[PDB]
Design a protein around this ligand. Sequence first.
Ligand SMILES: *C(=N)[C@H](C[C@@H]1CCNC1=O)NC(=O)[C@@H]1[C@@H]2[C@H](CN1C(=O)[C@@H](NC(=O)C(F)(F)F)C(C)(C)C)C2(C)C
Ligand SMILES: *C(=N)[C@H](C[C@@H]1CCNC1=O)NC(=O)[C@@H]1[C@@H]2[C@H](CN1C(=O)[C@@H](NC(=O)C(F)(F)F)C(C)(C)C)C2(C)C
Lengths: 305, 305
Amino acid sequence: SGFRKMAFPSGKVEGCMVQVTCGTTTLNGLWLDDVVYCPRHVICTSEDMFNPNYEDLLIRKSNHNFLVQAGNVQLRVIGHSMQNCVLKLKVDTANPKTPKYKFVRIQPGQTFSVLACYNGSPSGVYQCAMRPNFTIKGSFLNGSCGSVGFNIDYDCVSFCYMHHMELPTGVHVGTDLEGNFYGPFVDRQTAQAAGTDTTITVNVLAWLYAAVINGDRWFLNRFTTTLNDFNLVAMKYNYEPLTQDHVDILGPLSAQTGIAVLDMCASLKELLQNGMNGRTILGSALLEDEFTPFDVVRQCSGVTF
Amino acid sequence: SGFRKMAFPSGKVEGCMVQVTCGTTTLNGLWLDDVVYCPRHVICTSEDMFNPNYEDLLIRKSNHNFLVQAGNVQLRVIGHSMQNCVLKLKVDTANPKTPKYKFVRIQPGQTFSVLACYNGSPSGVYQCAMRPNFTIKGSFLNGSCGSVGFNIDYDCVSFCYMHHMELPTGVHVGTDLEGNFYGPFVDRQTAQAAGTDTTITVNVLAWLYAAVINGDRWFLNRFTTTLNDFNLVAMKYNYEPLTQDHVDILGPLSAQTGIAVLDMCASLKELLQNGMNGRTILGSALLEDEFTPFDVVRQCSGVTF
Ligand SMILES: *C(=N)[C@H](C[C@@H]1CCNC1=O)NC(=O)[C@@H]1[C@@H]2[C@H](CN1C(=O)[C@@H](NC(=O)C(F)(F)F)C(C)(C)C)C2(C)C
Ligand SMILES: *C(=N)[C@H](C[C@@H]1CCNC1=O)NC(=O)[C@@H]1[C@@H]2[C@H](CN1C(=O)[C@@H](NC(=O)C(F)(F)F)C(C)(C)C)C2(C)C
């Protein structure tokens, strides 16, 4: 028992982090087989970053302009290219610690772990959600770019995020590992704002099931609701609509606890309309929306990697 | 910017986890150089655990009764002994992934990361505090015993916790790596309860400094207070007394932000007496007490390992 925000073990990703320096700009890179992936703005000077022409900046660079360090070892760059907002540096050494991996593009509402790095070295690991407005609520400082987000499935690391920028509101934006941004953002230092965020309803419901599994049951009420009537209420409180697909992914938790999904929706509806009256759920006074249904099942059943 | 509950990168500890099986009981072990450390109740059957005589149970065991698996490799046990509540199994192979390490005993209020494991394999990592009542608010299931807690300082892993039991209230208790329990607990399945917990005042203050650093400043008031007058108020709200030692460890944050420690205490005192009026600090509606001053400085300055 107990329920914690839990990150994936980071070791498989730690063995892939390197430092990439171009000129005086140093950022983090991801070394998989004989390729280093990193954010393209490693080739920018401070003055270049307001309206960079990355293609032009890259034309002026040769392989040897990129200093790649893996621990105390310099990796020799033997090729380079740009794919959207990522640079790919081919090196003459394959990473012996490369895990089984794939590159995925995740959807809003899905969670992942971030290994925050500086100078190619890990600082810490935490769990995040891709928000419905395509931001993440991270913790990143200057030099963190190239830090990656990932999930693990048994032995396979699915990389889904590479960090690029911070928005004025303290939230973070980045790309998939093919260098395509999540959301309507561009890697230049110009005025950019995220759209209004919304609460990830299916994840709140998952967390209420986690609460039931841990014996925190006070919020269960005696009612049911229709999916339509629930969604009318959720809409007013800036909750995402609950779809049948969401209902289906809640199926395992619903079967395990014997609480129908639409019955949990009735209990959530009451929490939204009436509040919590100074009570907590799993120790929180606010409803939590950064656990997916899969996260809850994994944590409550002890799934390992 | 941004502030998250952050765990240490777990890879150094992942490379030390193994599975230990004795009879039909399987738990996790920590393999450092040529020694595996694990909880002694691996030698218990289900019936033994209500009033085990561990010395007697261990007399009947030979080296070969302990099956140690590191991945797909069986490690040959060549010696065994018991030190308080930990077994030490000498193996004929040194762990090639052993990090630089030490065993420490931490104090209440200090934080650490937990790598939760089952069958010798990692499930996830999260950050915890040793509570003032010597419990931790973890997430652990049957089979998690032998999972460890740790801090990292540059290249050195300080192991401070090994998991043994869950109390009826959903909280967790365990030992240091010399097998001595934190708190007045014993490893037998009998009625045991933790004392009343208390809020870790110096950590709340650290987190309010984190909030200021991130621009969440609304709670700063115009007043100061004496240490004595603060502690009278804290006492009523079940906050630990703030000592001069605590004031001193808050020094770096105080110097960085230019807010005197006793001035932050005046602001905390107002929050305790008046509440938060539906406002949040760093997104939380409750005051957070599981960041130490060192955690805040590390996260806000980008310290790496
Ligand atoms: C790379 N390490 C940093 C990481 C940022 C810095 C503070 N926290 C982070 O996560 N990335 C940048 O500095 C990028 C980089 C130039 C400007 N920039 C920004 O993050 C800026 N943001 C924006 O311009 C905005 F709002 F549009 F997103 C900054 C104002 C410095 C936070 C490039 C090329 C975009
Ligand atoms: C080892 N893997 C488990 C971990 C527990 C099980 C559920 N969550 C956990 O963290 N350890 C145990 O099962 C230990 C083990 C026998 C009994 N036990 C307990 O944790 C029990 N608790 C207590 O007896 C209490 F309250 F005294 F702490 C249990 C009731 C099963 C949770 C031994 C030898 C103590």
